[PDB]
Design a binder for this molecule. Sequence first.
Ligand SMILES: Nc1ncnc2c1ncn2[C@@H]1O[C@H](COP(=O)(O)OP(=O)(O)O)[C@@H](O)[C@H]1O
Length: 247
Amino acid sequence: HMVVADTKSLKLLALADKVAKTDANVMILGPSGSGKEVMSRYIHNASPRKEGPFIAINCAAIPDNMLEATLFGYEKGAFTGAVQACPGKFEQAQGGTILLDEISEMDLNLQAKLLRVLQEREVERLGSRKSIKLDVRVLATSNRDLKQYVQAGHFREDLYARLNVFPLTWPALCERKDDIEPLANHLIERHCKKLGLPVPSIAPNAITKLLNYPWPGNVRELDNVVQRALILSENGHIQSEHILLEG
Ligand SMILES: Nc1ncnc2c1ncn2[C@@H]1O[C@H](COP(=O)(O)OP(=O)(O)O)[C@@H](O)[C@H]1O
Protein backbone atom coordinates (compact mmCIF):
# COMPACT_ATOMS: atom_id res chain seq x y z
CA HIS A 1 0.00 0.00 0.00
CA MET A 2 1.48 3.31 -1.17
CA VAL A 3 0.79 6.63 0.57
CA VAL A 4 1.39 9.96 -1.14
CA ALA A 5 0.09 13.45 -0.37
CA ASP A 6 2.38 15.95 -2.07
CA THR A 7 1.04 17.33 -5.34
CA LYS A 8 4.35 16.22 -6.89
CA SER A 9 3.79 12.61 -5.84
CA LEU A 10 0.16 12.67 -6.95
CA LYS A 11 1.32 13.61 -10.45
CA LEU A 12 3.57 10.54 -10.61
CA LEU A 13 0.83 8.11 -9.57
CA ALA A 14 -1.28 9.77 -12.25
CA LEU A 15 1.34 8.67 -14.79
CA ALA A 16 1.87 5.30 -13.10
CA ASP A 17 -1.76 4.34 -13.65
CA LYS A 18 -1.40 5.07 -17.36
CA VAL A 19 1.54 2.69 -17.81
CA ALA A 20 0.11 0.10 -15.43
CA LYS A 21 -2.79 -0.48 -17.83
CA THR A 22 -0.28 -1.35 -20.56
CA ASP A 23 2.57 -3.85 -20.90
CA ALA A 24 5.23 -1.19 -21.41
CA ASN A 25 8.64 -1.45 -19.78
CA VAL A 26 8.69 0.99 -16.86
CA MET A 27 11.94 2.52 -15.61
CA ILE A 28 11.70 3.98 -12.13
CA LEU A 29 14.49 6.45 -11.37
CA GLY A 30 15.29 8.47 -8.25
CA PRO A 31 17.66 8.27 -5.25
CA SER A 32 18.14 5.30 -2.93
CA GLY A 33 15.49 5.21 -0.24
CA SER A 34 12.59 6.93 -1.93
CA GLY A 35 10.69 3.65 -2.29
CA LYS A 36 11.03 3.18 -6.03
CA GLU A 37 9.77 -0.40 -5.48
CA VAL A 38 6.55 0.01 -3.57
CA MET A 39 5.60 1.82 -6.78
CA SER A 40 6.51 -1.12 -8.98
CA ARG A 41 4.23 -3.29 -6.91
CA TYR A 42 1.62 -0.58 -7.31
CA ILE A 43 2.12 -0.76 -11.06
CA HIS A 44 1.79 -4.54 -10.84
CA ASN A 45 -1.34 -4.34 -8.72
CA ALA A 46 -2.76 -1.73 -11.09
CA SER A 47 -1.84 -3.82 -14.13
CA PRO A 48 -3.97 -6.48 -15.87
CA ARG A 49 -1.37 -8.93 -14.55
CA LYS A 50 -2.28 -8.06 -10.95
CA GLU A 51 -3.37 -11.62 -10.17
CA GLY A 52 -0.09 -12.85 -11.66
CA PRO A 53 3.27 -13.57 -9.98
CA PHE A 54 5.45 -10.70 -8.77
CA ILE A 55 9.14 -11.57 -8.89
CA ALA A 56 11.77 -9.18 -7.55
CA ILE A 57 15.55 -9.49 -7.81
CA ASN A 58 18.08 -6.93 -6.59
CA CYS A 59 21.01 -6.83 -9.02
CA ALA A 60 23.19 -5.01 -6.49
CA ALA A 61 22.72 -7.44 -3.61
CA ILE A 62 23.27 -10.89 -5.14
CA PRO A 63 26.48 -12.27 -3.60
CA ASP A 64 29.04 -14.67 -5.09
CA ASN A 65 28.38 -13.27 -8.60
CA MET A 66 25.17 -15.28 -8.92
CA LEU A 67 23.15 -12.50 -10.58
CA GLU A 68 23.28 -14.00 -14.08
CA ALA A 69 22.68 -17.51 -12.72
CA THR A 70 19.60 -16.52 -10.72
CA LEU A 71 18.01 -14.48 -13.53
CA PHE A 72 18.22 -16.99 -16.37
CA GLY A 73 18.50 -20.17 -14.33
CA TYR A 74 20.88 -23.02 -15.07
CA GLU A 75 21.10 -26.75 -15.73
CA LYS A 76 23.30 -29.12 -13.74
CA GLY A 77 26.92 -28.44 -14.63
CA ALA A 78 26.52 -25.00 -16.19
CA PHE A 79 29.29 -23.74 -13.91
CA THR A 80 31.55 -24.87 -11.07
CA GLY A 81 29.07 -24.88 -8.20
CA ALA A 82 26.01 -25.93 -10.18
CA VAL A 83 25.19 -29.20 -8.45
CA GLN A 84 21.52 -29.02 -9.40
CA ALA A 85 19.18 -27.58 -12.03
CA CYS A 86 17.37 -24.34 -11.19
CA PRO A 87 14.65 -22.17 -12.80
CA GLY A 88 15.41 -18.50 -13.44
CA LYS A 89 13.59 -15.45 -12.09
CA PHE A 90 12.13 -14.91 -15.56
CA GLU A 91 10.56 -18.37 -15.42
CA GLN A 92 9.19 -17.67 -11.94
CA ALA A 93 7.61 -14.46 -13.23
CA GLN A 94 5.69 -16.18 -16.02
CA GLY A 95 2.36 -14.46 -16.68
CA GLY A 96 3.22 -11.72 -14.20
CA THR A 97 5.75 -8.98 -13.52
CA ILE A 98 9.49 -9.07 -12.84
CA LEU A 99 11.42 -6.27 -11.15
CA LEU A 100 15.08 -5.74 -12.01
CA ASP A 101 16.15 -3.66 -9.01
CA GLU A 102 19.23 -1.44 -9.51
CA ILE A 103 19.68 -2.63 -13.10
CA SER A 104 22.75 -0.41 -13.52
CA GLU A 105 24.83 -3.10 -11.82
CA MET A 106 24.66 -5.65 -14.61
CA ASP A 107 27.97 -6.22 -16.39
CA LEU A 108 27.95 -5.29 -20.08
CA ASN A 109 27.66 -8.97 -21.00
CA LEU A 110 24.66 -9.67 -18.76
CA GLN A 111 22.99 -6.65 -20.37
CA ALA A 112 23.49 -8.31 -23.75
CA LYS A 113 21.75 -11.42 -22.44
CA LEU A 114 18.93 -9.32 -21.01
CA LEU A 115 18.53 -7.54 -24.35
CA ARG A 116 17.92 -10.80 -26.23
CA VAL A 117 15.28 -11.74 -23.67
CA LEU A 118 13.51 -8.42 -24.17
CA GLN A 119 13.72 -8.70 -27.97
CA GLU A 120 12.87 -12.36 -28.56
CA ARG A 121 10.61 -12.74 -25.50
CA GLU A 122 12.43 -15.97 -24.68
CA VAL A 123 14.88 -17.14 -22.05
CA GLU A 124 17.35 -19.99 -21.90
CA ARG A 125 19.00 -21.36 -18.77
CA LEU A 126 22.78 -21.53 -18.52
CA GLY A 127 24.04 -24.71 -20.14
CA SER A 128 20.70 -25.25 -21.87
CA ARG A 129 20.30 -24.62 -25.58
CA LYS A 130 16.53 -24.94 -25.26
CA SER A 131 14.69 -21.61 -25.25
CA ILE A 132 11.65 -20.94 -23.05
CA LYS A 133 8.77 -18.76 -24.23
CA LEU A 134 8.24 -15.78 -21.93
CA ASP A 135 5.09 -13.81 -21.20
CA VAL A 136 6.59 -11.39 -18.67
CA ARG A 137 6.11 -7.67 -17.99
CA VAL A 138 9.38 -5.94 -17.13
CA LEU A 139 9.98 -3.22 -14.54
CA ALA A 140 13.39 -1.84 -13.59
CA THR A 141 15.00 0.64 -11.19
CA SER A 142 18.24 2.63 -10.95
CA ASN A 143 19.57 5.40 -8.72
CA ARG A 144 21.96 6.75 -11.35
CA ASP A 145 21.42 8.70 -14.57
CA LEU A 146 21.43 5.81 -17.04
CA LYS A 147 21.76 8.16 -20.01
CA GLN A 148 25.16 9.50 -18.94
CA TYR A 149 25.95 5.98 -17.71
CA VAL A 150 25.38 4.89 -21.30
CA GLN A 151 27.61 7.78 -22.36
CA ALA A 152 30.23 6.48 -19.92
CA GLY A 153 30.10 3.17 -21.79
CA HIS A 154 28.99 1.10 -18.80
CA PHE A 155 25.46 0.53 -20.09
CA ARG A 156 24.20 -0.56 -23.51
CA GLU A 157 22.45 2.23 -25.41
CA ASP A 158 20.02 -0.21 -27.03
CA LEU A 159 19.06 -1.68 -23.66
CA TYR A 160 18.67 1.81 -22.21
CA ALA A 161 16.49 2.80 -25.15
CA ARG A 162 14.25 -0.22 -24.66
CA LEU A 163 13.83 0.54 -20.99
CA ASN A 164 13.44 4.30 -21.35
CA VAL A 165 10.09 4.23 -23.12
CA PHE A 166 8.32 5.54 -20.05
CA PRO A 167 10.71 6.70 -17.32
CA LEU A 168 9.38 7.78 -13.92
CA THR A 169 11.57 9.78 -11.57
CA TRP A 170 10.61 9.29 -7.95
CA PRO A 171 12.06 12.41 -6.24
CA ALA A 172 13.99 12.85 -2.99
CA LEU A 173 12.01 13.22 0.24
CA CYS A 174 12.98 16.88 0.64
CA GLU A 175 11.59 17.75 -2.80
CA ARG A 176 8.24 16.26 -1.79
CA LYS A 177 7.91 17.46 1.81
CA ASP A 178 4.14 16.94 1.96
CA ASP A 179 4.81 13.20 1.83
CA ILE A 180 6.74 13.28 5.10
CA GLU A 181 3.97 13.49 7.71
CA PRO A 182 1.68 10.84 6.17
CA LEU A 183 4.75 8.63 5.62
CA ALA A 184 5.97 8.94 9.21
CA ASN A 185 2.58 7.97 10.65
CA HIS A 186 2.42 5.01 8.28
CA LEU A 187 5.79 3.68 9.46
CA ILE A 188 4.73 4.13 13.08
CA GLU A 189 1.57 2.20 12.21
CA ARG A 190 3.30 -0.76 10.58
CA HIS A 191 5.56 -1.38 13.58
CA CYS A 192 2.76 -1.15 16.12
CA LYS A 193 0.74 -3.53 13.93
CA LYS A 194 3.74 -5.85 13.74
CA LEU A 195 3.90 -6.14 17.52
CA GLY A 196 0.20 -5.93 18.41
CA LEU A 197 0.72 -2.56 20.11
CA PRO A 198 -1.65 0.40 19.94
CA VAL A 199 -0.28 3.09 17.63
CA PRO A 200 0.71 6.31 19.45
CA SER A 201 0.38 9.90 18.28
CA ILE A 202 3.22 12.18 17.22
CA ALA A 203 3.67 15.66 18.73
CA PRO A 204 3.34 18.86 16.64
CA ASN A 205 6.87 19.82 17.66
CA ALA A 206 8.00 16.39 16.46
CA ILE A 207 6.37 16.78 13.05
CA THR A 208 8.05 20.15 12.48
CA LYS A 209 11.37 18.59 13.49
CA LEU A 210 10.69 15.87 10.93
CA LEU A 211 9.68 18.32 8.18
CA ASN A 212 12.76 20.54 8.47
CA TYR A 213 15.29 17.75 8.00
CA PRO A 214 16.59 17.36 4.42
CA TRP A 215 16.50 13.53 4.69
CA PRO A 216 19.63 12.58 2.71
CA GLY A 217 18.73 8.91 3.14
CA ASN A 218 15.12 9.71 2.29
CA VAL A 219 12.37 7.32 3.41
CA ARG A 220 14.80 4.60 4.50
CA GLU A 221 16.17 7.09 7.04
CA LEU A 222 12.70 8.28 8.01
CA ASP A 223 12.01 4.65 8.86
CA ASN A 224 15.10 4.58 11.08
CA VAL A 225 14.33 7.84 12.90
CA VAL A 226 10.82 6.52 13.57
CA GLN A 227 12.00 3.11 14.82
CA ARG A 228 14.43 5.02 17.01
CA ALA A 229 11.66 7.28 18.30
CA LEU A 230 9.43 4.30 19.08
CA ILE A 231 12.26 2.77 21.12
CA LEU A 232 12.87 6.00 23.02
CA SER A 233 9.17 6.70 23.65
CA GLU A 234 8.70 3.04 24.59
CA ASN A 235 5.90 2.82 22.01
CA GLY A 236 4.29 5.87 23.61
CA HIS A 237 3.48 9.42 22.48
CA ILE A 238 6.43 10.64 20.38
CA GLN A 239 7.85 14.02 21.39
CA SER A 240 10.35 16.40 19.74
CA GLU A 241 12.93 14.78 22.04
CA HIS A 242 12.62 11.21 20.76
CA ILE A 243 13.47 12.36 17.25
CA LEU A 244 17.23 12.12 16.75
CA LEU A 245 18.51 12.86 13.23
CA GLU A 246 22.11 13.66 12.27
CA GLY A 247 22.70 17.19 13.56
N1 LIG B 1 5.31 6.58 -1.00
C1 LIG B 1 5.53 5.58 -0.11
N2 LIG B 1 4.50 4.97 0.52
C2 LIG B 1 4.71 3.97 1.40
N3 LIG B 1 5.93 3.51 1.73
C3 LIG B 1 7.05 4.03 1.17
C4 LIG B 1 6.90 5.12 0.20
N4 LIG B 1 8.13 5.46 -0.21
C5 LIG B 1 9.01 4.67 0.45
N5 LIG B 1 8.37 3.81 1.27
C6 LIG B 1 9.06 2.82 2.13
O1 LIG B 1 10.48 3.02 2.05
C7 LIG B 1 11.16 1.78 2.20
C8 LIG B 1 12.28 1.61 1.17
O2 LIG B 1 11.73 1.59 -0.15
P1 LIG B 1 12.53 0.90 -1.36
O3 LIG B 1 11.57 0.71 -2.51
O4 LIG B 1 13.32 -0.27 -0.83
O5 LIG B 1 13.58 2.05 -1.76
P2 LIG B 1 14.70 1.84 -2.90
O6 LIG B 1 14.17 0.72 -3.76
O7 LIG B 1 14.78 3.17 -3.60
O8 LIG B 1 15.94 1.48 -2.11
C9 LIG B 1 10.12 0.68 2.06
O9 LIG B 1 9.97 0.03 3.32
C10 LIG B 1 8.82 1.38 1.71
O10 LIG B 1 7.72 0.79 2.41
